[PDB]
């Protein structure tokens, strides 16, 4: 009982409501009543619900139906479960091992012992890893008592692609919130493509093209030339400025991408938005077109996005005869734009959703071939407000060849926070190695291993950092300058700089 | 009162353990063990104890003492602890909060209450993550009863550097890398010698700037020297084994050599400890060691000697071009001694049991992606019962958005089917359902119904769910692959489509 039901998350409430994403065509009909076509699903977050509203026949690019709100009259008990294993659930709550779960949850017998005087019971679960959303499981028979309201119908807006669905989800965050007007982007994209077809210098570059199936390498050099020529045009002004220094946004990457697109798109694929999206979605290098690198979305204005898509479009049109099997170049301006637009929206949605950055909690920090992470969530928390010790474990390894760990930088506080020298150590494939710790200043201590440490494929390390607290005083924000522990990798030189591997921590009671 | 692990606690007659001893104390400590965690440490593994035997003043390159075995007469209680926080240990067991733990552990009140009849109690802790060894903590007063015996004295053997210590630690696995470093040392000199006093090699050794020159130009010349040097008969084996793998290219030997010449000054070259400390923080050493893709390729005395020799000569050439060392004896002196120590450290790590990438919670790093089983239990597929199981996989990537095309899953009719309704993937919390369809009778491929991209700031949790219709246990000879294949981006090699494969290895258990 207490081993599968989370009482703290269980509760009673009058007019319990939740949301249900609905496919195209069922938005008006479901309003007449919740009917079985083993459970009826709903969620507490109307935005997560919108993500289930896409046409099941065209899941990647199809149209989105809508979201409806379902409300149970009277009192409803929400029963939170710690596990989603039915047989396990049954063996604990002393239920009929033979009879289905959601079958018993709808019977009065179950409602009395678990409902707390409520008219019915609805099961609850964590919506997903990395989500604070809740997923509800409703009995079909009890669900028949739900009154249904229209929360929103995406089709009636009359927008293109899945624009309505994504503009809706973007409301959750309205760093920063990416809330782009894709109508304007679609409009600006078309306008720019057009301007870039009938021009002086750009039209000249098109006539200086092989226009025949050629090797990748030759296809790429011409494309880079095209990219450079094209980028000097006034309408790609801003793009030229924002793509000039970050290697990831270089012409060579726009060409690699364009070549790749031409290679995998044939006539049948070009003629279908769903199949095009499928093909493009598994390609590498898309971050170059989206201007997404180093954990941030750099292309976040309608103007710059339309310029990048227009430039990639034009380029794909060029890479087609040189690399593709396709004969109809129309694909570059039609489905390629439609498909890539969708992909942009997916990635933007992802950056808009709360998530831990590398080195925070158990999200690994990947850098220079190394992978480091806090072993457990509690490890990333430095508790305060007490005298005594604590231990914090950090996992460390590398992708291939032996890369060294020179040591670690740890925060200190003259008076309170101190590094416990004897308990701080690092182990390599189980070999325990002690460390030599010395203050580099009042607030930072550097610990170096007393034996050489290397990690790589097949060789991992556990860095165990231990802290000593002299007083029960709480660590205030100002006291600790940095917010991360710095593991140091290899040294590279005319100045010495170490590979910085960061693990971010939180200060709590 | 859950700070003691009774399952691992026991009483034993003549409880013995091992203690690593520093140089000069091997003989003396045998006369007897003498003085919050003031303790006398010992361990159940004499090889791990050998690792604490290195001179405190020169811990990187210094000499090793030896290992001694300590035995308590009569019966002894080994109390296994679940935590190393003394304060917690005091509060839970209901002891005084003001007096030091190890002081209290050696008293009769404690010895009667927890000793289960023993004459004294010894505390026990897990040695460390990735280790199955045990660390013992002894009360100094009680430790006076320990009889001390010699297991091995490393200096008595009279070997060079830390050879005796590493030869001894290598007995544990004696695939085991068990190299004879005397032979390797002797062959290194012989090879360095032949390579300096030769015809063809000295011809290239003459066409040198021999003056502080550009770093790029230093490399170029070194790559040619490497190219030329590698044609000598004494480096024939190395020529062949370093021929195709890019990690072992002359360019890497050059990058390595240049890096060495840049960080060694006369003071450093004159002190092995300082040389090791300087060299131990440089990248690219796997080029010289021949270590890549999870294996030690240079595992014969001959080939190891050639690589070090070749590296020594290159460092000798790199110095004038980039370094400021008026002397060049370093390349043949402390450079060889220090790099030898580093080969030994890395070899020892590959000799120790450890989980490979994609096993247990060790991540699998490849093509910018990083994937791992969420917990150790997730990597275990239980069999021998009708029912469902869930398995969570963490997925992310280093920088730009890379896609996840799907996942290849093993299937066994009745004993292991994919539960299509509960199999899904979440990206920064957005739950995405999957379309699962068999490729063949043994493998099922699940594609996400919404495009999936991971990268810096975007992670995914792939939740694989299995259904078992039969109670019959899955037998070993019934699954072809022991891994779950997560698929990343697709690439067209020439005109052939291949997927970036990310593997999570699982174990079948009852």
Author numbering:
A (entry chain A): 2 to 38, 51 to 187, 199 to 517, 520 to 535
B (entry chain B): 3 to 37, 49 to 187, 200 to 535
What does the paper say about this structure?
To verify if the rCRM197 produced from insoluble inclusion body protein have the overall similar 3D structure of the protein, we determined the X-ray crystal structure of rCRM197. The asymmetric unit contains four molecules of rCRM197 (chains A, B, C and D). The four chains interact as dimers (chains A–B and chains C–D) by domain swapping, with each monomer in ‘open’ conformation, a typical packing that has already been described for both DT and CRM197. The overall fold of the monomer rCRM197 is equivalent to C7-CRM197, with an overall RMSD of 0.34 Å for 451 out of 498 superimposed Cα atoms. The dimers in the crystal structure of rCRM197 and C7-CRM197, are equivalent. Furthermore, previous studies showed that the substitution G52E induces the dislocation of the active-site loop CL2 in C7-CRM197 with respect to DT. In our crystal structure of rCRM197, we have also observed a low electron density in the active loop CL2, consistent with the previous results. This confirms the structural basis of lack of toxicity in rCRM197. The structure revealed that the disulfide bond is conserved in rCRM197. In conclusion, rCRM197 conserves the overall folding, making it structurally equivalent to C7-CRM197, which is used in many licenced conjugate vaccine such as meningitis, pneumococcal conjugate vaccine etc..
